[PDB]
Design a protein around this ligand. Structure first.
Ligand SMILES: O=C(O)COc1ccc(-c2c[nH]c(CNC(=O)Nc3ncc(Sc4ccccn4)s3)n2)cc1
Ligand SMILES: O=C(O)COc1ccc(-c2c[nH]c(CNC(=O)Nc3ncc(Sc4ccccn4)s3)n2)cc1
Ligand SMILES: Cc1cc2nc3c(=O)[nH]c(=O)nc-3n(C[C@H](O)[C@H](O)[C@H](O)COP(=O)(O)O)c2cc1C
Ligand SMILES: Cc1cc2nc3c(=O)[nH]c(=O)nc-3n(C[C@H](O)[C@H](O)[C@H](O)COP(=O)(O)O)c2cc1C
Ligand SMILES: [Ca+2]
Ligand SMILES: [Ca+2]
Ligand SMILES: [Ca+2]
Ligand SMILES: [Ca+2]
Lengths: 307, 307
């Protein structure tokens, strides 16, 4: 099977493992790319030399295509722009801001640019400035969120633009992934579920937090970031009532690296209640792709001959 | 095609026009039922005598199945429970609370009860007291909302229960409706788009504000949290909360729906309002949703064939 995304990136499955701060090292990314998806290295707030070690890690693991995520609120944003170009990266995703100022530089470098868009207006602007595709991220996602859900944003983005759309936010199995294709997308982007992958270097405490979570276990803090509820999210809310960087500084690192799941930031999506097994990256990819195929096929049998 | 909902309810299409305070009178619920879906009179906050007039109006328009919505925050809840049983209404949907104390009375009346549920724990419990089906409503929906999205709530509720699930929130076309079926749903509930139906008695001003809205033109107010299209009321209400209500809130929806005061009334509508761009008959809407979905499911299955 083929979609414009499998053709554009030269990959087996129309699935991205979304770039994540701290979680998406060369190990996670490498395992995804290896099995046939697009593994994506999360730039995050990391210095150039930390992100570079990751790019080196991945190349030594596989020759398959890979992306690098540039998170536009990073203090080292300009260094990572240099880096993706310098290291020969073919795909760039961008998140948490407008990447417009870097678009011509990326395209002169032969790089494929796929921004994350939170609205139809920004989706269209990206199309008119040359963007090769866009990612519509719903508010149900883990991490730094917009306002619109996946249901409404994907459909309205897909309708507004002629470039290919990718659904992100709230997908953790084949049924969820196939829904993304119905809303008009040609690829899915998955975050929360890849965190529990065997190759993921997220601390056992962070993985077990996700695994035990119920549907309602997430909250939005710092109004904006979706995370699993703990002492830190309760602290922040209370200090929101009172009125602050003592809490917020290094919070994700505390969680992802050191396993402090009380005082750390345990970002994860509303779909974490559906995630309850540790698997390899390949086992996750196959479940999403063949799980979707199966469900699309079963529904077509139901609706067959209707006109 | 057949779903467990089409067979429980004996309806031609697995689509509910969602029970809506003020909007969902007899003429709208009639046209939906007459065209072959499930039209639903919304009880809202209305006295027993007003809802009876609606029930009286619908029976004279169509012989086909119809539902009545019981909104549980109503001052007149006990009377609307009475009313449905006395007038031989065969289906009841509920919203804004827990209907558990009414379950045994409804079933002794031979009534089919379909509660809206905001979580997995409430879906499971409704299943355990004998509910015939539930509605999963996402926070993207118009009106009074929970915290989970359609993408994530419908997945996790379809998964937790063996009774049929109906997907609500963010569906205005066949691609949207197909997506809901993909997540585990056996029918869809549509609100926003039915407001602009030719047979809807919503004020031309109110229909105009939907037709001209963008994806981003809704906001959450009063977080009883209501989703509505941004205007002077939402601006004044947000500010009134900001520094710190019944003077502003009282009768707000009636002012917009009936009188067309879309400046200072509550224009409840979903994030999918940016997609709703024309006035159509109820039948034209039902047919677009149904056959739109069919063609999208059929299209994607030829794309995925052999996988
Ligand atoms: O320019 C504007 O204001 C509008 O433009 C945009 C606004 C928002 C977005 C957007 C929303 N979501 C995303 C992708 N998701 C994310 O970026 N989620 C993230 N999680 C953890 C992150 S790390 C971090 C975060 C904050 C501070 C320091 N570090 S980023 N992009 C894209 C474009
Ligand atoms: O266990 C509990 O605490 C109660 O559980 C529930 C909690 C929430 C819900 C729920 C949320 N949304 C829905 C279905 N949607 C709606 O109920 N939407 C509505 N729009 C306009 C309405 S009219 C109104 C509303 C408030 C005050 C005065 N009038 S109701 N049900 C259902 C059950
Ligand atoms: C822990 C965590 C960190 C993330 N970091 C980034 C990031 O640095 N840049 C970005 O564009 N998106 C970031 N995201 C979003 C993901 O790339 C992806 O779009 C999202 O997880 C999809 O939603 P889901 O969690 O339901 O699967 C992050 C998400 C999580 C959960
Ligand atoms: C104006 C308006 C009034 C509503 N009133 C009720 C109600 O009284 N009881 C209820 O259970 N749901 C109510 N709802 C929810 C709808 O029946 C339906 O589930 C919802 O609108 C679906 O989301 P959508 O707007 O994206 O289609 C209302 C929705 C709107 C837009
Ligand atoms: Ca398109
Ligand atoms: Ca490891
Ligand atoms: Ca089920
Ligand atoms: Ca009329």
């Amino acid at each position: 099977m083929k979609t414009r995304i499998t053709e554009l990136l030269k990959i087996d499955y129309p699935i991205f493992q979304g770039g994540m701060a701290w979680v998406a090292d060369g190990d996670l990314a490498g395992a995804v790319s290896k099995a046939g998806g697009l593994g994506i290295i999360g730039g995050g707030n990391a210095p150039k030399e930390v992100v570079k070690a990751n790019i080196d890690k991945i190349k030594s693991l596989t020759d398959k295509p890979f992306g690098v995520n540039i998170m536009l609120l990073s203090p080292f944003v300009e260094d990572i722009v240099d880096l993706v170009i310098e290291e020969g990266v073919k795909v760039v995703t961008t998140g948490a801001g407008n990447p417009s100022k870097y678009m011509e530089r990326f395209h002169e470098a032969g790089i494929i640019v796929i921004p994350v868009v939170p609205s139809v207006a920004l989706a269209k602007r990206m199309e008119k400035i040359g963007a090769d595709a866009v990612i519509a991220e719903g508010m149900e996602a883990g991490g730094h969120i917009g306002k619109l859900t996946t249901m409404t944003l994907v459909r309205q983005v897909a309708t507004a633009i002629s470039i290919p759309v990718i659904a992100a936010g709230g997908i953790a199995d084949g049924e969820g992934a196939a829904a993304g294709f119905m809303l008009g997308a040609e690829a899915v982007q998955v975050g929360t579920r890849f965190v529990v992958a065997k190759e993921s270097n997220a601390h056992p405490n962070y993985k077990e937090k996700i695994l035990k979570a119920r549907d309602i276990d997430t909250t939005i803090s710092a109004q904006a970031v979706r995370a699993i509820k703990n002492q830190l999210t309760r602290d922040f809310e209370l200090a929101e009532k009172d009125a602050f960087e003592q809490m917020g500084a290094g919070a994700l690192a505390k969680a992802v690296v050191h396993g402090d799941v009380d005082g750390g930031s345990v970002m994860a999506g509303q779909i974490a209640g559906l995630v309850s097994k540790e698997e390899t990256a390949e086992e996750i990819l196959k479940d999403l792709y063949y799980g979707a195929a199966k469900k699309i096929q079963e529904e077509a049998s139901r609706w067959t001959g209707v006109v």
